[PDB]
Design a protein around this ligand. Structure first.
Ligand code: GDP
Ligand code: MG
Length: 241
């Protein structure tokens, strides 16, 4: 029953809730509350759905609920360690990874998304993602990725796998793909049936979800936990000085 917790984050209507169901299988109502969804694979996989952010005209301090949630899991874990009675196995409800959905605009990162990602990246591992990447043509995807990569660097946003931490060669493959071009679907024939052809979501030539999935739960899954435990949680623990 080894545990791994992922949280999806972004504005509403970006296919965030759809990708959650897509990930597990490997109309949905507008998400109004933070909801934790858990199924078993042996791994206990938890995907955390969240209300949209940046939906309002004014969005100051609108990152606080998600920020509260992330910090609440660190706090539960810390209090477990301080407990004198605890515990054969401390339950890990901490957010290990965080998929941040980026609107497939074509231009550049929005100050809104930059502001949010820059805050999240300090307390959790961020993996940027192009929402509804089927929107983009092949040439648009490449150009937009360049702008996102340039913007991430120029705004000092640490995405997983973080640079400061053979392994370097392996990690570049992950970094060259950020932001991941993902497509959501829960129908199978599994793809998204459009007017002109069906998009095969787990087909590497159609989108990049297949890569992200294997990179998140198979090859990097332990390292994401390790960074969560040794960097983010340890930094939280220190702050309680
Ligand atoms: N074009 C496209 N549409 C999608 C994709 N994933 C979901 N959608 C559609 O986007 C709409 C809202 O999706 P939803 O999962 O509720 O987004 P969320 O509210 O941000 O979680 C739905 O009508 C979906 O059918 C995708 O990969 N590509
Ligand atoms: Mg939703």
């Amino acid at each position: 029953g080894f545990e791994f917790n992922i949280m999806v984050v972004g504005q509403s209507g970006l296919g965030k809730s759809t990708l959650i169901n897509t990930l597990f299988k490997s109309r949905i109502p507008k998400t109004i509350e933070i909801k934790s969804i858990t199924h078993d694979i042996r791994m206990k996989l938890t995907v955390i759905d969240t209300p949209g952010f940046g939906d309002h005209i004014n969005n100051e301090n609108c990152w606080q609920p998600i920020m509260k949630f992330i910090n609440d899991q660190y706090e539960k874990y810390l209090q477990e360690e301080v407990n004198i009675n605890r515990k054969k196995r401390i339950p890990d409800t901490r957010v290990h990874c965080c998929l941040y959905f980026i609107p497939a605009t074509g231009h550049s990162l929005r100050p809104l998304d930059i502001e949010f990602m820059k805050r999240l990246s300090k307390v959790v591992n961020i993996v940027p993602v192009i929402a509804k990447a089927d929107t983009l043509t092949l040439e648009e995807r490449v150009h937009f990725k360049q702008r996102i990569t340039a913007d991430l660097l120029s705004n000092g946003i640490d995405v997983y796998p973080q640079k400061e931490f053979e392994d370097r060669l392996v990690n570049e493959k992950f970094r060259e793909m950020i932001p991941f071009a993902v497509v959501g679907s829960d129908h199978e024939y599994l793809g998204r049936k459009t007017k002109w052809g069906t998009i095969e979501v787990e087909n590497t030539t159609h989108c990049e979800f297949a890569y992200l999935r294997d990179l998140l739960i198979r090859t990097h899954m332990q390292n994401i936990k390790d960074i969560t435990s040794s960097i983010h949680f340890e930094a939280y623990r220190v702050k309680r000085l």
